[PDB]
């Protein structure tokens, strides 16, 4: 059960502005009536987010493979439950482990194993008129799942799946971070009434979960639901209707923000301390209002564009096998002293030849040994 | 296989080059190209490692390079004694491990010699013996890169011929021999045969006709 | 050669003795280096430079601002160019 | 010697082998042509064979002592060669792709018929061999297995111009050679020119006279 | 237990941490804490408790520490530099070894790059040491990336197998559910008291 869909029209990408969206509570401490300065991975203010849709009549089922650079802000405007979850991984092809978060019509399923995902993974709802019901029919995501490490399944429920015809009534925002083998998810749901173009406003996302998955993540992809009924003849790859939903993707970077807690403990506003010089001053003043005048800000900074390494021209490898693998050593009162000259220090070649059980360095850390040049060895 | 020209020689104290000119996906598509050396009777000795590297020993006259699908060796200064065969070698694709063809490398301090050729038709008793053999002898041709081709009345032939490898005589030049198998009816079929030998571009041929 | 940093590299006129690899200024920061492959001397100059001030009529009246780059001469190392330079 | 369809055991020493990246390929060499690869064993237990050999040869290392085994089975008699044990050259964990230690190898011969006596013909002196003052005549001694064979001229009398050429090994598996001597063209039939053929592994002794063509 | 390249991770939820019950069942010989002193373990509540476990060689036990290099710490198991829990290891030669060798325990020997902290690499793709690819067969400059320990019972100590458990957790800041053996009292309000919450 895995198909390559067709009957899809071509279009260039669309972009939108994020009007101060994507702020979350950065700890689990209660604060009230205060302005707190915090550094973390945030979505910068007035960022260029990417816009994906899916309206048929024109068909547009967007679910490409997008990067997952340092974290992701994901927003979805819907009315009829079209976005169902995501898959995260590096190759997504059963040579590596991948994470799957999905919402069946009855459970929420989180699984971190070895999947063989399709080129076009999706779910699918079928609509009968004889029977008064939209029902969940297809689940075409992966072919195999071999060596699973983590699994969670929520308590059973039943969603609506019914196709509405009004305007977008539900906004759902998520922040995905991946640090120290923890996949952290922050979330917020909001009631809206809108037609397009993700709105403005401010709402802070609250911590949802930390999954201990311990995998490498560099790409991800969204899982959408399909619509099939008596009006979609096709065969199984041209007989489908899209629906109506939109979702927006932006990327987090390390920023300093100034958050404002009201008396009830809610974050109601924030200042991005690197957006403008005006915000720089607002943030160094620790206030949201600036009085008439002239203020000194930080010096003019330029960021580095490239990274270069320049080591000497050395080809040989160091005599690891005539120092550690010698046949006969010396006694301690007349100890030997060998001179190490122009050679390459690759101490990984010893990983399969000898264990040590005592190895202590003194002027230098062991994690920076293959990044330095040594003078008198 | 790979290709290398079977004969190359020069004056002592000079630079001779040897080309290995393989295809892609073994020599062009890789970098693990080596060069060996086999004195006549001993085991091979690794003379040049990958592209241009050396083991210990190996006095620095030998050098290697690669310019695409052709790697080449160069000896800078023939002392007296670097006569060898110099097989080039490469790692091909699937653990294959291909080899070369071998180039003799002499050093005629004097002047090249002329390959004296001598041809004999099948004797009479052999004719009565329901068989026939042509006999082509080559001798005294200093530099040993001889090759041979056999001729029926006008065309070349490539079946029934055996060719000795060159062998060193007392005077320290070479000698060789080749045999042609024929049924006597084919012997009288064609009006004449010949043995030609090529040596340093030059060529000399001899010819015999049945009676 | 293991020494990390950030900056701008330019061709130099300093001339090191053969036993020297790095050059230091009075604040003891490395400001010259000998390239280990071409054996040429390079100067290392920092990247950030120049003061900046922001002129506001008060954010209780408008969020229009002007910016004064105290080390630029335009006739650039600026954040924006807009109009009215 | 071994008749085709047989088998043979070739063994070498894998001293210092259990470290990974320690290939120990096997390479043949025909008596006169040049080198050709045969097989390879990788120290992580992997075997690979060349074409035209595959399925007939098998490497089975003895991890007990140190001995490496190549079993040849059902030899086709186009495998007669020196066989060498080529140990690889390693640059750390990277296999360099060259063989630095060899072992002088074992001669492996595959033939048939066992032995056989030579057939002799006289190659007459002729005007096509004659040129000016001299003309050449000889004896062709062919089709024999037992390599050491000798042909003399006139019981060892003539040492001038007598030149025996290296024997040639045919596809039939039997050797052949021809020994020729030049003699003044005034002396075509005049004196005695009898080639004395002696085959020492057998007991063949035949004298053949060479005379100008009829 | 588990081998080190695919190490297990158990979740410790709402329970009482009485580590005195271990005083008569097992000795340890390696037990080091990092974010906390050992004399205040039964006086705190712990938030996110996880227990990793594997089996390594006796010489590589020193590698289970933040800021280490070597075969285990490079690409088998990596601790963050801001680690908080405790590391425990004990000799296990009487259990996990047998005559002739026990080859149920494996480790990764080759990788392109070092692991990030607290990740797991269970892929068995063939490592390419050379410039030419090898398409999923072992051979010239291509090795299977997993090797097995040889644990025969009379080995030098340090080649004998060790069981290692890593306790990961957090202190204060958030709600906890583990706690120690401490006993609670009643709530006295409107007075000056010492408190332990
Ligand atoms: C869907 O389309 C993709 C191409 O976009 C097909 O892909 C190839 O799949 C075969 C295995 O079946 C691989 O060996 C090729 O290397 C793949 N090529 C590419 C460009 O991907 C895929 O087979 C199609 N699947 C279906 C069900 O139609
Ligand atoms: C280090 O290696 C580089 C090449 O990898 C050498 O650069 C060569 O320098 C000579 C100058 O005499 C140029 O003619 C070549 O074109 C250079 N090669 C390349 C590839 O740029 C350099 O010489 C080596 N270092 C030393 C000290 O010799
Ligand atoms: C041959 C001498 C070269 C010395 C080079 C100088 C500095 C480089 C330092 C190398 C430290 C090697 C220690 C080996 C660590 C392996 C740990 C393990 O066993 O798991
Ligand atoms: C977003 O970036 C793209 C990149 O080309 C650009 O075309 C587009 O104008 C940008 N959008 C905004 C709102 O700046
Ligand atoms: C949804 O998928 C999960 C994944 O295994 C499955 O356990 C569950 O039963 C599915 N839903 C229903 C209603 O069966
Ligand atoms: C409704 O009818 C469809 C067939 O049209 C059937 O597949 C489905 O199970 C039925 N559901 C209910 C609740 O009757
Ligand atoms: C994953 O599956 C492969 C093949 O089925 C198997 O060799 C491997 O042992 C499995 N992983 C684990 C951790 O058992
Ligand atoms: C919280 O503050 C809001 C105004 O910011 C107020 O409307 C609300 O009543 C407060 N919540 C309570 C009653 O605790
Ligand atoms: C030295 O290396 C050899 C393999 O070449 C190995 O057999 C021996 O055990 C090693 N000895 C030491 C002390 O490393
Ligand atoms: C600035 O705003 C505050 C609060 O909105 C207001 O009280 C104050 O009067 C404003 N300033 C002026 C000059 O009106
Ligand atoms: C994550 O996967 C990518 C695949 O492109 C790989 O290059 C990278 O090295 C992996 N992460 C680490 C820390 O190695």
Residue numbers in the entry:
A (entry chain C): 14 to 70, 76 to 395
B (entry chain M): 3 to 213
C (entry chain C): 544 to 618, 633 to 642
D (entry chain I): 11 to 224
E (entry chain B): 347 to 543
Quote the paper.
Receptor binding domain (RBD) on the S protein is a determinant that mediates the binding of SARS-CoV-2 to the angiotensin converting enzyme 2 (ACE2). Here we describe a monoclonal antibody, 2G1, that neutralizes all current VOCs and has surprising tolerance to mutations adjacent to or within its interaction epitope. Cryo-electron microscopy structure showed that 2G1 bound to the tip of receptor binding domain (RBD) of spike protein with small contact interface but strong hydrophobic effect, which resulted in nanomolar to sub-nanomolar affinities to spike proteins. The epitope of 2G1 on RBD partially overlaps with angiotensin converting enzyme 2 (ACE2) interface, which enables 2G1 to block interaction between RBD and ACE2.
To investigate the binding mode of antibody 2G1 on S trimer, we solved the cryo-electron microscopy (cryo-EM) structure of 2G1 in complex with S trimer at 2.7 Å resolution. So, we performed local refinement and improved the antibody-antigen interface resolution to 3.2 Å, enabling reliable analysis of the interactions between the RBD and 2G1. The heavy chain of 2G1 interacts with RBD mainly through three complementarity-determining regions (CDRs), named CDRH1 (residues 30–35), CDRH2 (residues 50–65), and CDRH3 (residues 98–111). The light chain of 2G1 participates interaction mainly through two CDRs, CDRL1 (residues 23 to 36) and CDRL3 (residues 91–100). The interface between RBD and 2G1 is stabilized by an extensive hydrophobic interaction network. CDRH1 and CDRH3 of the 2G1 heavy chain were positioned above the LA-binding pocket in the adjacent RBD’.
